[PDB]
Design a protein around this ligand. Structure first.
Ligand SMILES: Nc1nc2c(ncn2[C@@H]2O[C@H](COP(=O)(O)OP(=O)(O)O)[C@@H](O)[C@H]2O)c(=O)[nH]1
Length: 384
């Protein structure tokens, strides 16, 4: 069972390798354009504008590679205090990463990301110090970053970052600082209550600022109706009706069939206890566990596909534009050299020098075409 998050990992590896090659190619092409422009025996074969363009591309292709190397998937959890946001995150991480009662006292956002080390730690905004996660109660707009060993959670190994927000009912400017790059928003609701307008309004604001945000609703604490099956079915219908209407008719972010794959009824407490033990069950436990596992699979499929487009499409488009321009420059150099060869070149040494320029510009043009093909292959595989 291969995690869908590997789609993102593979896309990130592919696009970073393309940009490594692109930087090397533009560096080589810039050296060629410079030598051609600077040759005192050549007039107007490569222009000063040709060189400035190539150097400008060279000067900015490195930071694209470094920026791409740090791209990650991000899921953000929202909901009323004690709905179960921290517990859902812990269940997905298979451990008690965010401590008990942290939701009572946290007024900062808490993010969880992977670390290559074997020791968990946290970092605050104004330093590089790695602090004990045992101080997270003291440290928790503000953001506290929790780092958890990648060897312990496959989600973190596969470049997912999970963000816990302060309770919606006791606090937006949240969107700008910690939501412009979130790929998925998860509303955690208390299934013993009813979906509230305070929660709806927040996702209305996300919806107005982002084009078709990916939104899941987890009706948590579903174990509270265990052994009440007839009751459970009717409460499920009522929650489903209200959650469907919100996603489909109010937000209009999903049609009614796809909405079935965005609303789930779960017990994060049961799931965490089952998973911490893996490293006398209430009635319906396994059905609820299976529903949480189905949510995780659908969530991973959603966020991996979505994040590849969101995080990598613009730079893929830019790389194609850079290559088209470099090809145009190589075309211009070749054409100017060949024109000169046939219009006014006289001595066989001048002719041989122009033929070398033609040949090297063609070698570079063909290298650009090969990188265009790699970008087309990337687009076909990763950018539907
Ligand atoms: N019965 C039950 N209790 C839960 C569930 N999820 C969380 N809780 C409990 O509800 C309390 C608050 O949960 P927490 O995850 O801290 O809520 P948060 O404030 O939204 O982060 C804690 O005591 C949890 O143990 C659940 O699925 N079922």
């Amino acid at each position: 069972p291969v995690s869908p998050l590997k789609h993102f990992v593979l896309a990130k590896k592919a696009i970073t390798a393309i940009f490594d090659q692109l930087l090397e190619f533009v560096t080589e092409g810039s050296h060629f354009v410079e030598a051609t422009y600077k040759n005192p025996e050549l007039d107007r074969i490569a222009t000063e504008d040709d060189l400035v363009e190539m150097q400008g591309y060279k000067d900015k292709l490195s930071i694209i590679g470094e920026v791409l190397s740090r791209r990650h998937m991000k899921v953000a959890f929202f909901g009323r205090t004690s709905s179960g946001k921290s517990s859902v995150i812990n269940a997905m991480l298979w451990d008690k990463v965010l401590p008990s009662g942290i939701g009572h006292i946290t007024n900062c956002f808490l993010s969880v990301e992977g670390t290559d080390g074997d020791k968990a730690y946290l970092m605050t905004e104004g330093s590089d110090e790695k602090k004990s996660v045992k101080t997270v109660n003291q440290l928790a707009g503000c953001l506290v970053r929790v780092f958890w060993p990648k060897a312990k959670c496959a989600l973190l190994r596969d470049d997912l970052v999970l963000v816990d927000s302060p309770g919606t009912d006791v606090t937006d400017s949240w969107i700008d600082k910690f939501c412009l790059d979130a790929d998925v928003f998860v509303l955690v609701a208390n299934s013993e209550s009813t979906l509230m307008n305070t929660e709806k309004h927040f996702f209305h604001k996300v919806n107005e600022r982002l084009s078709k945000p990916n939104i899941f609703i987890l009706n948590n604490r579903w174990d509270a109706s265990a052994s009440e099956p007839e009751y459970m079915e009717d409460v499920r219908r009522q929650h489903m009706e209200r959650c469907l209407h919100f996603l489909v008719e109010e937000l209009k972010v999903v049609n009614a069939l796809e909405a079935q794959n965005r609303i789930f009824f779960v017990s994060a407490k049961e799931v965490l206890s089952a998973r911490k033990q893996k490293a006398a069950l209430a009635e319906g436990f396994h059905a609820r566990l299976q529903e949480f596992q189905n949510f995780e699979q659908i969530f991973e499929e959603c966020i991996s596909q979505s994040a590849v487009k969101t995080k990598f499409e613009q730079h893929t488009i830019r790389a194609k534009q850079i290559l088209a321009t470099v090809k145009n420059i190589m075309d211009s150099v070749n054409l100017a050299a060949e024109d000169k060869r046939h219009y006014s070149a006289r001595l066989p040494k001048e002719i041989d020098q122009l033929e070398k320029i033609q040949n090297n510009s063609k070698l570079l043009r063909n290298k650009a075409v090969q990188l265009e093909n790699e970008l087309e292959n990337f687009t076909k595989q990763f950018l539907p």
